[PDB]
Design an enzyme around this catalytic site. Structure first.
Site, PDB file in Angstrom:
ATOM      1  N   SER A 347       8.881   7.695   7.062  1.00 52.82           N
ATOM      2  CA  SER A 347       7.599   8.048   7.654  1.00 52.82           C
ATOM      3  C   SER A 347       6.995   9.136   6.781  1.00 52.82           C
ATOM      4  O   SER A 347       7.535  10.241   6.705  1.00 52.82           O
ATOM      5  CB  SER A 347       7.767   8.526   9.094  1.00 52.82           C
ATOM      6  OG  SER A 347       6.691   9.351   9.480  1.00 52.82           O
ATOM      7  N   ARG A 348       5.891   8.824   6.108  1.00 54.77           N
ATOM      8  CA  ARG A 348       5.266   9.818   5.250  1.00 54.77           C
ATOM      9  C   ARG A 348       4.652  10.959   6.047  1.00 54.77           C
ATOM     10  O   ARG A 348       4.459  12.044   5.497  1.00 54.77           O
ATOM     11  CB  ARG A 348       4.206   9.159   4.369  1.00 54.77           C
ATOM     12  CG  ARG A 348       4.792   8.236   3.321  1.00 54.77           C
ATOM     13  CD  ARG A 348       3.715   7.525   2.519  1.00 54.77           C
ATOM     14  NE  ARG A 348       2.922   8.462   1.735  1.00 54.77           N
ATOM     15  CZ  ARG A 348       3.222   8.867   0.508  1.00 54.77           C
ATOM     16  NH1 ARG A 348       4.306   8.438  -0.120  1.00 54.77           N
ATOM     17  NH2 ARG A 348       2.416   9.728  -0.103  1.00 54.77           N
TER      18      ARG A 348
END
Ligand code: ATP
Ligand code: ADP
Ligand code: ADP
Ligand code: MG
Ligand code: MG
Lengths: 493, 92, 468, 464
Positions: A347-348
């Protein structure tokens, strides 16, 4: 006022002569209630994609222009309803009172109309919420082979929003849109049933483009769902939209583009398929407070083949989204359910999408699980192994067990925090691996019944305070005194 | 089926590499402290050297197989495009 | 008002009609081949309106002997087939001609083979288990009554034998009506099935519709629709439970692809028609139960070159409630039925439907087989002695489990000389529970090969020396 | 003079002009969508002359709402972007429209985005090193002035902080400026970058050019050229050193492939445009040093399928002069910048460019770090106690070296209150020569964290 004439027709496409003032992507009315979309415009004719009942198209039929691009009705009356991509109910429950209409191709929020993703969108799945957290306004790709549990993850996420809904607070409520593309009708019906049993149709709309629908409807369904969600997003609401599956939408668009003889590229896709998906997914956004601060979180689903993520459409969508949950059939068969490959899922947005307590408890999970994966070859022995590495192995096995979760069982964020606390603070060390799951559940129930103020503290403050921490540790130790293992050994100390 | 076979070979070689590496490290531990993985010893330290050699060979094999798999991947994309565009050209 | 043939290229014919007389899409036209050796009446189905009063049609029969300029007559409707209880006990071709008794059914009610699928509000998910007595199917891939079942597999892995086994096990005692669609498969197999049904007295309850692989692509595209029209009549009008068997539904897609470029369509990936998913979806969404009206459908799905990523089977997967996947790798080990337990699936294999015992035993079997598959490469290169003792225990258990998933099926007697067996669900669950616990680890693995329940296991073990 | 739209096929628009008014190739044409919901001004780039006074163009915006026969105006020039100091601290799209302040820059000088590389006589015949003042980069993977650096790094490895550091260092050490090209820019991340650069106060030193992911392939193809045009103005007219960031260069290649497909060109190997190498060359050869000033580019590169033989990464790497891989492993140890000293490399780390002593020190550092990497698995599983005395000494020395490659970064001041350090190259070489010799083994490990040269190390050692 102008009238065109069908000059030829085949395979859901019809060519129309005349209509000199027709717009690109305009809706066209053919005889008998049949609808088409003007896609290819040239000096000879308009290539129109027919949106159903194509078999009624005949050479020589007169064609009217609506003077409108594609648009759908929008409003709160769509909650709890199933509609086709034109916004028309298909559940048999009557008309839907629309608040207004939205053109499907309205531009996404610009780079200056947004604000950083900062609020959690709790899926209720520990693996996701702890390892690949999703914020509000994020696009998280759920990608994997068939039958790896992708729909289950998205349905559990939708179900998890029920408690938020019951608060009545629009800044906590999440309205859900589920877009089914290319699924068989009974499958959509079973998704609707699962949502009904969980009380989620109160705040969910389904946009259905089943496998029998025209390729045009499968192509449009994600944009219809997006328009319905955008209406809410721009009115300060928070929206979660699931696309299941975008690979089916890409296939439908490819079918259309080939039938219109547009030049093909890799895997016969047109040169604008990346654009199809990117313009769809950039409409999921977190708006600036000047625009009401609403948001739409995207959960596109992609089905890979033989876990080939370098295929064309998976590559496109992976590049487009802000993080990917990879589901794997090997992990599924091993009993790791949800079958999320924690090693490669990302998850950026990261910790910006987690509450403080979750950030604290989940901080070491990634490193612990990576270390456990490194030592997995040495389980066979667990001997002549440095005590630190043996402890890493045991802890990692317990953490893997902790991230397993039954279907349709989303957990409140406070319950997840406490379960991860059990795993990461060493409280599962004394428990047999095979009992871990049971332990967790039982413990949580105990806390729900007798010490529900730990949950209340976490929920209200978003932090696990020191006093709450020692209270929880005491509760865990008493429960351990009370717990009965599967092998009959004692889990005390 | 060439790419499927190469991927299966890559998976097999990866598992073998993991096992041989674990054996090498365990033989290292047991040096400080029947079976046939001892190299030319019959013909712990010898098992350590044999497993080092085997894990390095597995790594080399994985690299070669991955190169071959990527060549097959690119060739398949190219061939599929050639068929698609050949059909389109025939119709155009 | 009649048309005239303008172009002929294989199974595709272009026909010119007078202005205002162009037939509607999917209408059946008639042309004559008057050459003596091949004299016949061609049925052409209108596929496209080309413009300028030209229509592109697909022939249902071979076009050898057809001449440019011959008259073409528009019947005014699509292909229609006889419906009603009269069709039971008889064999038809895609056009509704009775094969075993020509002329029969000409006076029945006739239904167009083109139909829309049921309205979405009539669809109810089906979750009742359909018990077969086959260990692997019942344990790991439980079939659904009124559900959609498929048997996937490469060429010659056992799809047709399994279809015949399910016709033996489900259709023999079925209280409703059966429809069998031979779609682009061997004529010998169709004759064999016809004779077998007559032998079992199941024919009187069965309607058989055949368009075999020697037929032109048009027939192979429309025969599934014809059989489905008969089944739809039984579901909608007569209100009885229907069993629909289709072998092989891939041939419908393949027939569509054979003519796609001749219809002027740009090819999609892997040489398929661009309309693969859409045409498949129309056909499949017709194949369904509705609320109160049951169709249990079982389709054999050919996986080209055993490539389960091929677009045809990949698109098909989304349409099933249960899928038995047959693997060449399992086949080549002599394990029959050659089911891949790790790749098969069922939407009712869930604790809520099958119960906790069934589900737990199934999950344990799957876990063990998955671990064994993970270990096979190590066993092959480094040998089994390098495994941990626990992994050796698992390998022995897994070999016994995979063998015990094999079964002597009735329809396979001709291939083994051994009569088939049937294992009740409860016995399957208890036996595999015991196997996963290691209660039969003292028996040779060969004792578990091609037997029924635990009594057969005890007998075979005794015959091999050991005792249960 | 005006044309009229004849055919509309997605983003491909065919336009007919009178006999003597056919626009030149790559000319920008304007057309109006008047439908209220989607009313806008399309920009079309002339791609082909089809004959009979018809040109085929790529629309820079979606063509929904476009009508056949509407008027088309030839601007008489290609896409032109504003240039000058006024572009610093603002956000533009590929066409040169300001996104943070619409209408801003209309009065500036405008430069065509299609320009030649410097002539052959004007190119520098000797490669030069770009001294950033960062120890790990300067020592192990020196940057080439006017060269190209690939940046590899996943989420949360300080890539954004490294970019901010480079903006800082070019602005202060070299008196230069920065242009960021977001090719296939995620709108969320474009907004985040804009806000973060404003907060870090480096926005005033940078010009942002975004060709966003939700745009048709033409702008994603041309945004790199637009950004490069601003950089070229800074180098050639203002006599500045420019740092040009390109994230992501693969998305430029892929936008080119998509445009090639839309225009009906037969794909080349692996489905890329036939002109792949030519397009990449036209972009990259403009990033050069000339007349004593340089554009140095740091480019994020995506490698399809992790296959470095894939035509896109192969063509890109034909132009790259160094690689900086940011490692999660190094980041998780608190070592910033999180550069992987073994994975990263440079094409000018050879004696003939950096000199014999620099090369010697760097090779020794690399040898020590590689030995430690090899010993790490035994350390982790068996345990440190199982190592020989020489192995333990090597491990301690390598831990000290690997920690001394961290540095207090200028961009890091916003997180940790301490300011950043610039370390001269000679001092770095001396320091790491000494560390290899073991002269600082007695010092504690925690004393090598986030400092500059030897004076910082001495002060920190006394403090501990
Ligand atoms: N957490 C879970 N625990 C146990 N079983 C699960 C879980 N999640 C999903 N399953 C089961 O796994 C199977 C696959 O689920 P699902 O249909 O959601 O996956 P999918 O990847 O979307 O599949 P498809 O290819 O059909 O779209 C179903 O039987 C579902 O019940
Ligand atoms: N259950 C079985 N037992 C023994 N042999 C079998 C069994 N199933 C298939 N076979 C062998 O494999 C062959 C292929 O079966 P078939 O069902 O015709 O293949 P397909 O998958 O092409 O339909 C059979 O003719 C038979 O010889
Ligand atoms: N040199 C540094 N000093 C202190 N903190 C840093 C440094 N580099 C990175 N970080 C921290 O690591 C986090 C991720 O770095 P950043 O590059 O901003 O994110 P991303 O790489 O995902 O864009 C930041 O929030 C920052 O606080
Ligand atoms: Mg699904
Ligand atoms: Mg068969």
């Amino acid at each position: 006022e102008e009238i065109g004439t069908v000059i030829d027709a085949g395979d859901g496409i019809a060519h129309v002569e005349g209509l000199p003032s027709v717009m690109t992507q305009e809706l066209l009315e053919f005889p008998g209630g049949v609808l088409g979309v003007a896609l290819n415009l040239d000096e000879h004719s308009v290539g129109a994609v027919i949106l159903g009942e194509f078999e009624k198209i005949e050479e020589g039929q007169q064609v009217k222009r609506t003077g409108e691009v594609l648009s759908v009705p929008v409003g709160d009356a769509f909650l709890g309803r199933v509609v086709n991509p034109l916004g028309q109910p298909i559940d048999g429950q009557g008309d839907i009172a629309a608040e207004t209409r939205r053109a499907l191709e309205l531009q996404a929020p610009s780079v200056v109309q947004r604000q950083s993703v900062s609020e959690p969108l709790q899926t209720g799945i520990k693996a996701i919420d702890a390892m690949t957290p999703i914020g509000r306004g994020q696009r998280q790709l759920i990608i994997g082979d068939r039958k790896t549990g992708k729909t289950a993850v998205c349905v559990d996420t939708i179900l998890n929003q029920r408690e938020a809904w019951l608060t009545g607070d629009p800044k906590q409520q999440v309205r859900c849109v589920y877009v089914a593309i290319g699924q068989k009708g009974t499958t959509i019906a079973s998704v609707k049933r699962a949502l009904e049993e969980g009380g989620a149709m109160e705040y969910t709309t389904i946009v259905a483009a089943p496998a029998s629908d025209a390729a045009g409807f499968k192509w449009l369904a994600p944009y219809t769902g997006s328009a319905i969600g955008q209406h809410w997003m721009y009115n300060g609401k928070h929206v979660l939209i699931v696309f299941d599956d975008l690979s089916k939408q890409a296939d439908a668009y490819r079918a259309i583009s080939l039938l219109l003889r547009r030049p093909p590229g890799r895997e016969a896709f047109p040169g604008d398929v990346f654009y199809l998906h990117s313009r769809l997914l950039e409409r999921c956004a977190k708006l600036s407070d000047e625009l009401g601060g609403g948001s739409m979180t995207g959960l596109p689903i992609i089905e890979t083949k033989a876990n080939d993520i370098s295929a064309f459409i998976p590559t496109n969508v992976i590049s487009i989204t802000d993080g990917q949950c990879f589901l794997e059939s090997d992990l599924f068969n091993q009993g790791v359910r949800p079958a999320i490959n924690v090693g490669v899922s990302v998850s950026r947005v990261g910790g910006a999408a987690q509450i403080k307590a979750m950030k604290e408890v989940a901080g070491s999970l990634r490193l612990d699980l990576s270390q456990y994966r490194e030592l997995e070859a040495f389980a066979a022995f667990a001997s002549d192994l440095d005590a630190a590495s043996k402890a890493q192995l045991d802890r990692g096995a317990r953490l893997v067990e902790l991230l397993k979760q039954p279907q349709y069982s989303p957990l409140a964020v406070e319950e997840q925090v406490v379960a991860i606390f059990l795993g990461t603070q060493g409280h599962l060390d004394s428990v047999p691996v095979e009992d871990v799951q049971r332990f967790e559940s039982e413990l949580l129930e105990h806390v729900k019944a007798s010490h529900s103020d730990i949950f209340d503290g976490i929920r209200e403050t978003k932090k696990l305070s020191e006093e709450a921490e020692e209270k929880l540790v005491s509760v865990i130790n008493e429960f351990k005194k009370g717990f009965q293992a599967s092998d009959g050994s004692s889990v005390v100390v | 089926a060439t790419l499927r076979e190469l991927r299966g070979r890559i998976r097999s070689a990866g598992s073998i590499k993991k096992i041989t590496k674990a054996q090498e490290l365990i033989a290292t531990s047991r040096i400080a402290k029947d079976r046939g993985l001892c190299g030319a010893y019959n013909a712990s330290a010898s098992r350590r050297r044999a497993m080092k050699s085997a894990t390095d060979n597995a790594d080399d094999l994985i690299k070669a197989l991955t190169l071959a798999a990527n060549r097959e991947r690119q060739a398949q994309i190219t061939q599929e495009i050639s068929e698609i565009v050949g059909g389109a050209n025939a119709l155009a | 008002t009649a048309g005239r043939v303008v172009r002929i290229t294989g199974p595709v014919v272009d026909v010119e009609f007078p202005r205002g007389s162009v037939p509607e899409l999917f209408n059946a036209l008639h042309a004559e081949i008057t050459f003596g050796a091949l004299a016949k009446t061609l049925t052409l189905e209108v596929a496209q309106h080309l413009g300028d009063s030209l229509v592109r049609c697909i022939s249902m029969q071979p076009t050898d002997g057809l001449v440019r300029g011959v008259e073409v007559t528009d019947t005014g409707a699509s292909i229609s087939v006889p419906v009603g209880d009269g069709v039971k006990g008889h064999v038809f071709n895609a056009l509704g001609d009775c094969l075993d008794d020509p002329g029969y059914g000409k006076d029945f009610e006739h239904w167009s083979i083109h139909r829309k699928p049921p309205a979405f509000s009539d669809l109810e998910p089906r979750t009742e288990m359909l018990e077969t007595g086959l260990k692997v199917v019942d344990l790991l891939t439980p079939y659904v009554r009124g559900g959609k079942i498929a048997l996937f597999g490469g060429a010659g892995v056992g799809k047709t034998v399994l279809i015949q086994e399910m016709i033996n096990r489900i259709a023999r005692n079925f209280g409703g009506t059966s429809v069998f669609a031979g779609v682009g498969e061997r004529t010998r197999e169709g004759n064999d099935l016809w004779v077998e049904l007559a032998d079992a007295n199941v024919l009187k309850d069965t309607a058989l519709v055949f368009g075999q692989m020697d037929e032109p692509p048009g027939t192979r595209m429309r025969v599934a629709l014809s059989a489905l029209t008969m089944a739809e009549f039984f579901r909608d009008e007569q209100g009885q439970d229907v069993l629909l068997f289709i072998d092989n539904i891939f041939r419908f897609t393949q027939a569509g692809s054979e003519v796609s470029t001749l219809l002027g369509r740009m090819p999609s990936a892997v040489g398929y028609q661009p309309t693969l998913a859409d045409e498949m979806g129309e056909l499949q969404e017709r194949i369904t139960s509705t609320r109160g009206r049951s169709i249990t459908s079982m389709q054999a799905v050919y996986v080209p070159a055993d490539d389960y990523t091929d677009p045809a089977p990949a698109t098909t997967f989304a349409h099933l409630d249960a899928t038995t996947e047959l693997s060449r790798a399992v086949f080549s080990k002599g394990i029959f039925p050659a089911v891949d337990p790790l790749a098969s699936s069922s939407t009712i294999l869930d604790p809520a439907i099958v119960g906790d015992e069934h589900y737990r035993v199934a999950q344990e079997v799957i876990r063990i087989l998955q671990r064994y598959k993970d270990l096979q490469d190590i066993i092959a290169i480094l040998g089994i002695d390098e495994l941990s003792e626990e992994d050796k225990q698992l390998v022995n258990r897994a070999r016994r489990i995979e063998r015990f998933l094999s079964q002597n099926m009735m329809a396979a007697e001709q291939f083994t000389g051994q009569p088939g067996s049937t294992v009740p669900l409860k016995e399957t669950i208890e036996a595999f529970d015991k196997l996963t616990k290691g209660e039969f680890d003292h028996l040779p693995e060969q004792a578990f090969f091609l037997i029924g329940g635990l009594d057969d296991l005890a007998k075979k073990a005794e015959s091999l020396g050991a005792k249960l």
